[PDB]
Amino acid sequence: KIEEGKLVIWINGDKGYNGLAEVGKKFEKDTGIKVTVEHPDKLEEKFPQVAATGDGPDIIFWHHDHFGGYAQSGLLAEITPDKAFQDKLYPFTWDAVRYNGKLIAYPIAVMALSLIYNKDLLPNPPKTWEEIPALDKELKAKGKSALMFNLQEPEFTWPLIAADGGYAFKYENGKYDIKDVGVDNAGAKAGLTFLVDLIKNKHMNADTDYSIAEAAFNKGETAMTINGPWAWSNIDTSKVNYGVTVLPTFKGQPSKPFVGVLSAGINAASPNKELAKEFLENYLLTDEGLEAVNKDKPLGAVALKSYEEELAKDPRIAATMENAQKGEIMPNIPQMSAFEYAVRTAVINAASGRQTVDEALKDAQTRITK
Ligand SMILES: [Cu+2]
């Protein structure tokens, strides 16, 4: 019970649904087809309900992690870019939109955490995790701290923990292995330890949450923090002089951030697959298209090479991409819930004393692979 003759698009209201609308006006002028951009409440939960009955929008915008499940249900259509088109985007973004060996979405935006710092308290940021401890002691002498970041959730703590070799699920030939998890190997143990030790020595507090960390860094009390593109505006208003850069290395290896990709999938029920493909590939994924959305509401870093080289003139953005090329693509499978649940607890119990690192990671590991 879907259109045929137009295009309805569901995008979250905190995104540039206006420039998306603008790009629509050009499509309409060139094709004569009208585009509609809507923002239903809690759309991530409605698409699944409505698409299961052959209804909903022709295109849905969202993080790629939810896309694996959608495909396990045959809700999306297998896109069809050719060799040439595929060479317009970064090789690693296509892996983020794969399933059982096949492509199912178009990478739009690329997100990943970064290290943020107060240029007035820290003229040059640390290239290593190993040196932070000594840096905090040097600042505490003046009534400041070195680092403060959300410690409640895996998104913020996984980068360190996995640098040495840990991981979510083994992957190599286009298929994941839900029985082979790496949160309990040597590397993952090495990283959690380093983190726990930071708290034990009072360089960090275990109850620090997103709000405290942001309030602290924006009042100008802490030299650094870790966060994404979505938090820059608050800082802009606070009157702090900040900078964004590459995350420190661990035991000589890069921090390994989870990589998130805003994607556009075609409803498998949609009678407008061609139009949708023409719109996404030749209107939205162009330097003019991505700019239109980025104006209304900034996107951060993108997957389109040509335009990424232009946005990358803002160090804040160049850093994001570099951190993404070193990170681990977020697995697009429903089992990632088991992972977030288990790891969030492991880190909390390990930071509270309730469990030692070796015990905490043994439980989660077994939990997930269960
Ligand atoms: Cu989600």
Short mmCIF file of N, CA, C and O in Angstrom, two decimals, residues 71-162:
data_model
loop_
_atom_site.label_atom_id
_atom_site.label_comp_id
_atom_site.label_asym_id
_atom_site.label_seq_id
_atom_site.Cartn_x
_atom_site.Cartn_y
_atom_site.Cartn_z
N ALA A 71 17.28 -6.52 7.52
CA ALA A 71 17.56 -7.45 6.42
C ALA A 71 17.29 -8.89 6.81
O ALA A 71 16.95 -9.73 5.97
N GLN A 72 17.45 -9.21 8.08
CA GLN A 72 17.20 -10.59 8.50
C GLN A 72 15.72 -10.83 8.23
O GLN A 72 15.29 -11.97 8.14
N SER A 73 14.95 -9.73 8.14
CA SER A 73 13.52 -9.77 7.89
C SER A 73 13.13 -9.43 6.46
O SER A 73 11.95 -9.28 6.17
N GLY A 74 14.11 -9.28 5.57
CA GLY A 74 13.82 -8.95 4.19
C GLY A 74 12.99 -7.68 4.01
O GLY A 74 12.12 -7.63 3.15
N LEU A 75 13.27 -6.67 4.82
CA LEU A 75 12.53 -5.40 4.74
C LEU A 75 13.19 -4.43 3.79
O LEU A 75 12.55 -3.49 3.32
N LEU A 76 14.48 -4.65 3.51
CA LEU A 76 15.23 -3.77 2.63
C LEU A 76 15.44 -4.40 1.27
O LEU A 76 15.22 -5.59 1.11
N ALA A 77 15.85 -3.59 0.30
CA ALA A 77 16.11 -4.08 -1.04
C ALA A 77 17.62 -4.11 -1.28
O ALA A 77 18.35 -3.24 -0.81
N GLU A 78 18.09 -5.11 -2.01
CA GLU A 78 19.52 -5.21 -2.30
C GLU A 78 19.86 -4.15 -3.34
O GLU A 78 19.48 -4.26 -4.50
N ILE A 79 20.57 -3.11 -2.91
CA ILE A 79 20.94 -2.04 -3.82
C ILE A 79 21.84 -2.58 -4.93
O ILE A 79 22.38 -3.69 -4.83
N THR A 80 22.01 -1.80 -5.99
CA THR A 80 22.81 -2.26 -7.11
C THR A 80 23.83 -1.30 -7.73
O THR A 80 23.80 -1.05 -8.93
N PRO A 81 24.76 -0.75 -6.92
CA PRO A 81 25.72 0.15 -7.56
C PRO A 81 26.72 -0.68 -8.40
O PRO A 81 26.93 -1.86 -8.11
N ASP A 82 27.29 -0.08 -9.44
CA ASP A 82 28.28 -0.77 -10.28
C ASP A 82 29.69 -0.55 -9.74
O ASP A 82 29.88 0.14 -8.74
N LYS A 83 30.68 -1.14 -10.41
CA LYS A 83 32.07 -1.01 -9.98
C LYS A 83 32.47 0.46 -9.83
O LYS A 83 33.00 0.87 -8.80
N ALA A 84 32.18 1.24 -10.87
CA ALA A 84 32.51 2.66 -10.87
C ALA A 84 31.89 3.46 -9.72
O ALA A 84 32.58 4.20 -9.05
N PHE A 85 30.59 3.31 -9.51
CA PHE A 85 29.95 4.04 -8.44
C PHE A 85 30.54 3.67 -7.09
O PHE A 85 30.74 4.53 -6.23
N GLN A 86 30.79 2.38 -6.90
CA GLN A 86 31.36 1.91 -5.64
C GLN A 86 32.72 2.54 -5.36
O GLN A 86 33.11 2.68 -4.20
N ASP A 87 33.44 2.91 -6.41
CA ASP A 87 34.74 3.54 -6.22
C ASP A 87 34.65 5.04 -5.88
O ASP A 87 35.66 5.73 -5.87
N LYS A 88 33.44 5.53 -5.60
CA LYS A 88 33.25 6.94 -5.23
C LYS A 88 33.28 7.06 -3.71
O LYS A 88 33.49 8.15 -3.17
N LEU A 89 33.04 5.95 -3.02
CA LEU A 89 33.03 5.94 -1.56
C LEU A 89 34.20 5.13 -0.98
O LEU A 89 34.82 4.32 -1.68
N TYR A 90 34.48 5.35 0.30
CA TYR A 90 35.57 4.65 0.97
C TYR A 90 35.26 3.16 1.15
O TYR A 90 34.27 2.77 1.76
N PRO A 91 36.13 2.29 0.60
CA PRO A 91 35.96 0.84 0.69
C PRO A 91 35.33 0.31 1.98
O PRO A 91 34.39 -0.49 1.94
N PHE A 92 35.82 0.79 3.12
CA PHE A 92 35.30 0.32 4.40
C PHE A 92 33.85 0.67 4.73
O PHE A 92 33.27 0.06 5.64
N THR A 93 33.24 1.65 4.04
CA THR A 93 31.84 1.99 4.35
C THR A 93 30.88 0.97 3.73
O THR A 93 29.77 0.77 4.22
N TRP A 94 31.31 0.32 2.66
CA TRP A 94 30.48 -0.69 2.02
C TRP A 94 30.34 -1.92 2.92
O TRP A 94 29.32 -2.61 2.89
N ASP A 95 31.37 -2.19 3.73
CA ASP A 95 31.32 -3.34 4.63
C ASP A 95 30.24 -3.11 5.68
O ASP A 95 29.60 -4.05 6.15
N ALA A 96 30.04 -1.84 6.04
CA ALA A 96 29.06 -1.45 7.04
C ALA A 96 27.62 -1.67 6.57
O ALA A 96 26.70 -1.74 7.39
N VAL A 97 27.43 -1.76 5.26
CA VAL A 97 26.11 -1.95 4.69
C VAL A 97 26.01 -3.27 3.94
O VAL A 97 25.35 -3.35 2.90
N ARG A 98 26.64 -4.31 4.48
CA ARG A 98 26.62 -5.63 3.87
C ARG A 98 25.82 -6.62 4.70
O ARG A 98 25.55 -6.40 5.89
N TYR A 99 25.46 -7.73 4.07
CA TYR A 99 24.71 -8.77 4.74
C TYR A 99 24.75 -10.03 3.89
O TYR A 99 24.46 -9.99 2.69
N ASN A 100 25.13 -11.15 4.51
CA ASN A 100 25.23 -12.42 3.82
C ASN A 100 25.85 -12.25 2.44
O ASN A 100 25.42 -12.86 1.46
N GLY A 101 26.87 -11.40 2.37
CA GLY A 101 27.54 -11.17 1.11
C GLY A 101 26.91 -10.15 0.19
O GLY A 101 27.37 -9.97 -0.94
N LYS A 102 25.86 -9.46 0.65
CA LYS A 102 25.21 -8.47 -0.21
C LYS A 102 24.93 -7.08 0.37
O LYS A 102 24.62 -6.92 1.55
N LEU A 103 25.05 -6.09 -0.51
CA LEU A 103 24.82 -4.68 -0.18
C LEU A 103 23.34 -4.35 0.05
O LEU A 103 22.50 -4.76 -0.75
N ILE A 104 23.04 -3.61 1.11
CA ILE A 104 21.66 -3.28 1.43
C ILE A 104 21.33 -1.84 1.84
O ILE A 104 20.21 -1.56 2.27
N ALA A 105 22.28 -0.93 1.70
CA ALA A 105 22.05 0.46 2.06
C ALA A 105 23.13 1.38 1.50
O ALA A 105 24.17 0.91 1.04
N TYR A 106 22.86 2.68 1.52
CA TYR A 106 23.81 3.66 1.02
C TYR A 106 24.40 4.45 2.18
O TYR A 106 23.66 5.11 2.91
N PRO A 107 25.73 4.39 2.36
CA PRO A 107 26.40 5.11 3.44
C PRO A 107 26.25 6.61 3.20
O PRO A 107 26.54 7.09 2.11
N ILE A 108 25.80 7.36 4.21
CA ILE A 108 25.65 8.80 4.06
C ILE A 108 26.69 9.50 4.96
O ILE A 108 27.66 10.09 4.49
N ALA A 109 26.48 9.41 6.27
CA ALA A 109 27.38 10.04 7.23
C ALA A 109 28.17 9.01 8.03
O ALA A 109 27.72 7.88 8.27
N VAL A 110 29.36 9.42 8.47
CA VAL A 110 30.27 8.57 9.25
C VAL A 110 30.59 9.22 10.60
O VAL A 110 31.10 10.33 10.65
N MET A 111 30.28 8.53 11.69
CA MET A 111 30.57 9.07 13.02
C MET A 111 31.52 8.19 13.81
O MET A 111 31.63 6.99 13.57
N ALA A 112 32.21 8.82 14.77
CA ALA A 112 33.15 8.16 15.66
C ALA A 112 33.63 9.18 16.69
O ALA A 112 33.71 10.36 16.39
N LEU A 113 33.94 8.72 17.89
CA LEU A 113 34.42 9.61 18.94
C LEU A 113 35.77 10.26 18.58
O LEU A 113 36.43 9.86 17.63
N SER A 114 36.15 11.27 19.33
CA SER A 114 37.42 11.94 19.11
C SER A 114 37.85 12.52 20.43
O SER A 114 37.06 12.59 21.38
N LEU A 115 39.11 12.94 20.50
CA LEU A 115 39.63 13.56 21.71
C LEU A 115 39.43 15.07 21.55
O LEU A 115 39.82 15.65 20.54
N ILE A 116 38.82 15.69 22.55
CA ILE A 116 38.57 17.13 22.51
C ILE A 116 39.36 17.80 23.63
O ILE A 116 39.40 17.28 24.73
N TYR A 117 39.97 18.95 23.36
CA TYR A 117 40.76 19.62 24.39
C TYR A 117 40.74 21.15 24.44
O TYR A 117 40.50 21.82 23.44
N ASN A 118 41.00 21.69 25.63
CA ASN A 118 41.05 23.13 25.88
C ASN A 118 42.44 23.64 25.52
O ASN A 118 43.42 23.36 26.22
N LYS A 119 42.53 24.39 24.43
CA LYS A 119 43.81 24.90 23.97
C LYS A 119 44.49 25.81 24.99
O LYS A 119 45.71 25.98 24.96
N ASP A 120 43.71 26.39 25.90
CA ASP A 120 44.29 27.28 26.90
C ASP A 120 44.89 26.53 28.08
O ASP A 120 45.70 27.08 28.82
N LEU A 121 44.49 25.27 28.25
CA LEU A 121 45.02 24.46 29.35
C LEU A 121 46.01 23.43 28.81
O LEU A 121 46.89 22.97 29.53
N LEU A 122 45.85 23.08 27.54
CA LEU A 122 46.70 22.08 26.90
C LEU A 122 47.04 22.56 25.49
O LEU A 122 46.24 22.44 24.57
N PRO A 123 48.25 23.11 25.29
CA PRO A 123 48.63 23.58 23.95
C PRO A 123 48.81 22.45 22.93
O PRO A 123 48.57 22.64 21.73
N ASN A 124 49.23 21.28 23.40
CA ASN A 124 49.43 20.12 22.54
C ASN A 124 48.93 18.86 23.24
O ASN A 124 49.38 18.52 24.32
N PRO A 125 47.98 18.15 22.62
CA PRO A 125 47.42 16.93 23.20
C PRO A 125 48.38 15.73 23.16
O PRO A 125 49.29 15.66 22.34
N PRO A 126 48.18 14.76 24.08
CA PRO A 126 48.98 13.54 24.21
C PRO A 126 48.69 12.51 23.10
O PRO A 126 47.53 12.22 22.81
N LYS A 127 49.74 11.97 22.50
CA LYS A 127 49.59 10.98 21.43
C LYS A 127 49.41 9.59 22.01
O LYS A 127 49.06 8.65 21.29
N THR A 128 49.64 9.46 23.31
CA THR A 128 49.53 8.18 23.98
C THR A 128 48.63 8.17 25.21
O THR A 128 48.48 9.19 25.90
N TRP A 129 48.02 7.02 25.47
CA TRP A 129 47.17 6.88 26.66
C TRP A 129 48.10 6.83 27.87
O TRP A 129 47.81 7.39 28.93
N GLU A 130 49.22 6.13 27.69
CA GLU A 130 50.21 5.94 28.73
C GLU A 130 50.64 7.19 29.49
O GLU A 130 50.93 7.13 30.68
N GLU A 131 50.66 8.34 28.82
CA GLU A 131 51.09 9.57 29.47
C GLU A 131 50.05 10.39 30.22
O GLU A 131 50.40 11.32 30.96
N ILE A 132 48.78 10.07 30.06
CA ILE A 132 47.75 10.84 30.73
C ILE A 132 47.93 10.98 32.24
O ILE A 132 47.84 12.08 32.79
N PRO A 133 48.19 9.86 32.94
CA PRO A 133 48.37 9.88 34.40
C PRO A 133 49.29 11.01 34.88
O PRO A 133 48.93 11.78 35.78
N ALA A 134 50.47 11.10 34.28
CA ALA A 134 51.43 12.14 34.64
C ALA A 134 50.91 13.54 34.29
O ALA A 134 51.26 14.52 34.93
N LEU A 135 50.08 13.62 33.25
CA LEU A 135 49.52 14.89 32.83
C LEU A 135 48.47 15.41 33.82
O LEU A 135 48.37 16.62 34.06
N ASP A 136 47.68 14.50 34.39
CA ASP A 136 46.66 14.90 35.35
C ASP A 136 47.25 15.48 36.64
O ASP A 136 46.72 16.44 37.20
N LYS A 137 48.34 14.87 37.09
CA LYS A 137 49.03 15.31 38.31
C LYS A 137 49.57 16.72 38.12
O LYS A 137 49.56 17.54 39.05
N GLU A 138 50.02 17.01 36.91
CA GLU A 138 50.57 18.31 36.60
C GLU A 138 49.50 19.39 36.61
O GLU A 138 49.79 20.55 36.93
N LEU A 139 48.26 19.03 36.27
CA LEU A 139 47.16 19.99 36.24
C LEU A 139 46.50 20.15 37.59
O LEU A 139 46.09 21.25 37.97
N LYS A 140 46.38 19.04 38.32
CA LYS A 140 45.77 19.06 39.63
C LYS A 140 46.46 20.07 40.55
O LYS A 140 45.87 20.55 41.53
N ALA A 141 47.70 20.41 40.22
CA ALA A 141 48.49 21.35 41.00
C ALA A 141 47.98 22.78 40.88
O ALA A 141 48.42 23.66 41.62
N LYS A 142 47.05 23.00 39.95
CA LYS A 142 46.48 24.33 39.75
C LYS A 142 44.95 24.31 39.90
O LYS A 142 44.29 25.33 39.68
N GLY A 143 44.39 23.16 40.25
CA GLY A 143 42.95 23.08 40.42
C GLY A 143 42.21 22.82 39.12
O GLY A 143 41.19 23.43 38.83
N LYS A 144 42.76 21.90 38.33
CA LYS A 144 42.20 21.50 37.05
C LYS A 144 42.42 20.00 36.98
O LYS A 144 43.13 19.45 37.80
N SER A 145 41.81 19.35 35.99
CA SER A 145 41.99 17.92 35.81
C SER A 145 42.35 17.71 34.35
O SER A 145 42.16 18.61 33.54
N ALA A 146 42.89 16.53 34.00
CA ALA A 146 43.26 16.26 32.62
C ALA A 146 42.09 15.74 31.78
O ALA A 146 41.73 16.33 30.75
N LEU A 147 41.48 14.65 32.23
CA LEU A 147 40.41 14.06 31.46
C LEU A 147 39.12 13.74 32.22
O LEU A 147 39.15 13.35 33.39
N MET A 148 38.01 13.91 31.52
CA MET A 148 36.67 13.62 32.03
C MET A 148 35.78 13.26 30.84
O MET A 148 35.62 14.04 29.91
N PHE A 149 35.23 12.05 30.87
CA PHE A 149 34.34 11.59 29.82
C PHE A 149 33.35 10.57 30.35
O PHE A 149 33.60 9.91 31.36
N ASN A 150 32.21 10.45 29.67
CA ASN A 150 31.17 9.52 30.09
C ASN A 150 31.78 8.12 30.25
O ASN A 150 32.43 7.62 29.34
N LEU A 151 31.60 7.52 31.42
CA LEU A 151 32.15 6.20 31.70
C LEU A 151 31.05 5.17 31.89
O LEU A 151 31.32 3.99 32.11
N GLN A 152 29.81 5.63 31.80
CA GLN A 152 28.67 4.77 32.00
C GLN A 152 28.42 3.80 30.86
O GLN A 152 27.96 2.69 31.09
N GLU A 153 28.76 4.21 29.64
CA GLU A 153 28.40 3.40 28.46
C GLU A 153 29.56 2.98 27.57
O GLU A 153 30.49 3.76 27.33
N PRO A 154 29.50 1.74 27.03
CA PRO A 154 30.48 1.10 26.14
C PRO A 154 30.94 1.92 24.95
O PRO A 154 32.05 1.74 24.47
N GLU A 155 30.08 2.83 24.46
CA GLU A 155 30.42 3.67 23.32
C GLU A 155 31.66 4.49 23.64
O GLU A 155 32.54 4.66 22.79
N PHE A 156 31.73 4.99 24.87
CA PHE A 156 32.83 5.83 25.31
C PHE A 156 34.09 5.09 25.82
O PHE A 156 35.19 5.65 25.81
N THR A 157 33.94 3.84 26.25
CA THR A 157 35.06 3.10 26.80
C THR A 157 35.66 1.98 25.94
O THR A 157 36.76 1.50 26.22
N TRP A 158 34.95 1.57 24.91
CA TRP A 158 35.43 0.50 24.04
C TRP A 158 36.71 0.80 23.23
O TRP A 158 37.49 -0.11 22.93
N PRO A 159 36.91 2.07 22.85
CA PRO A 159 38.10 2.45 22.07
C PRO A 159 39.43 2.00 22.69
O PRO A 159 40.34 1.52 21.99
N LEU A 160 39.55 2.18 24.00
CA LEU A 160 40.75 1.81 24.74
C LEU A 160 40.83 0.29 24.85
O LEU A 160 41.78 -0.33 24.40
N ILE A 161 39.79 -0.28 25.46
CA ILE A 161 39.69 -1.71 25.70
C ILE A 161 40.05 -2.64 24.53
O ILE A 161 40.57 -3.74 24.76
N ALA A 162 39.80 -2.20 23.29
CA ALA A 162 40.04 -3.03 22.10
C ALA A 162 41.29 -2.73 21.27
O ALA A 162 41.61 -3.47 20.34
#
